[PDB]
DNA sequence: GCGCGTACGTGCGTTTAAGCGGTGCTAGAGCTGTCTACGACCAATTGAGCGGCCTCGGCACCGGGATTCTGATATCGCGCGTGATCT
């Protein structure tokens, strides 16, 4: 499902975004395939370094926002995941509309 | 000044082709030599162009008249609203 250079979805806040995998980290043998060992200037977060994490560059966002990803924050870019990302988007939009309506009512 | 709506701007992704480096080919721009005929120069002269004067008629002036025409009001017609009568 998670192929090097492939497409996927990711967790960031309450809304999902499309991302492309640039590197994949194997913790058992401790290197990433883009087998290249950890660089001095490259650091993987400790919370996910022990697990197989993924370097992903997200679509619709500049190149200088990419970072490493564990299993939890990422998902396969399938029809179910696409629909659920859309659902999260509509939920956020409705929540914002409800908040602004509540503020307007309070002001009155 | 206010309100709407939409159409550029900003940004990210994908695609295109500009750009650079390299080599080949030959077309034409440049240069050189030679030669001829075209133009400047000169002299003579006569005729086309210019200054001037005269005659006249095209057009500027002035007066009277016809014609738009611009603006308002009003009349008449059409449409909308209110009242009265019929179903």
The reply to whether the CB atom of residue A13 sits less than 7 A from any atom in nucleic acid chain B is: no
Run of H or E including A76: none
Which structure tokens are listed for A56? 């992903």
Residue A57, SS3?
strand
Cα(first)–Cα(last) distance of chain A, in Å? 52
Distances (CA, A) of A11 to A21, A51, A93, A104: 14, 17, 17, 31
Distances (CA, A) of A107 to A38, A99, A100, A102, A103: 55, 12, 11, 9, 6
The angle formed by the CA atoms of residues A18, A36 and A62, to the nearest 5 degrees, is 30
The answer to whether the CB of A55 falls within 8 A of the CB of A32 is: yes
For every residue of A19-34, DSSP letters joined together read EEEEEEEETTTTEEE-
What resolution in angstroms, rounded to 1 decimal? 2.8
> Which technique was used to obtain these atomic coordinates?
cryo-EM
The reply to whether the CB atom of residue A64 sits less than 7 A from any atom in nucleic acid chain B is: no
The reply to whether the CB atom of residue A58 sits less than 7 A from any atom in nucleic acid chain B is: yes
Nucleotide B59 C1' to residue A60 CA (A): 83
Which structure tokens are listed for A42? 């490259």
Nucleotide B54 C1' to residue A58 CA (A): 103
Which structure tokens are listed for A100? 């602004």
The reply to whether the CB atom of residue A60 sits less than 7 A from any atom in nucleic acid chain B is: yes
Q: How many CA atoms lie less than 13 Å away from A80 in the CB half-sphere?
A: 2
**Nucleotide nearest the Cα atom of A65 (by C1'):** B12
């Amino acid at each position: 499902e998670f192929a090097l250079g492939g497409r996927c979805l990711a967790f960031h806040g309450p809304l999902m975004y499309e991302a492309k995998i640039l590197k994949i980290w194997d913790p058992s043998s401790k290197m990433y395939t883009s087998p290249q060992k950890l660089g001095e200037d490259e650091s993987i977060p400790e919370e996910i370094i022990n697990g197989k994490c993924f370097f992903i560059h997200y679509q619709g966002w500049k190149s200088s926002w990419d970072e490493w990803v564990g299993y939890d924050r990422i998902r396969a870019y399938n029809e179910e995941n696409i629909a659920m990302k859309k659902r999260l988007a509509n939920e956020a939009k409705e929540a914002k509309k409800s908040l602004l309506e509540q503020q307007k009512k309070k002001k009155l």
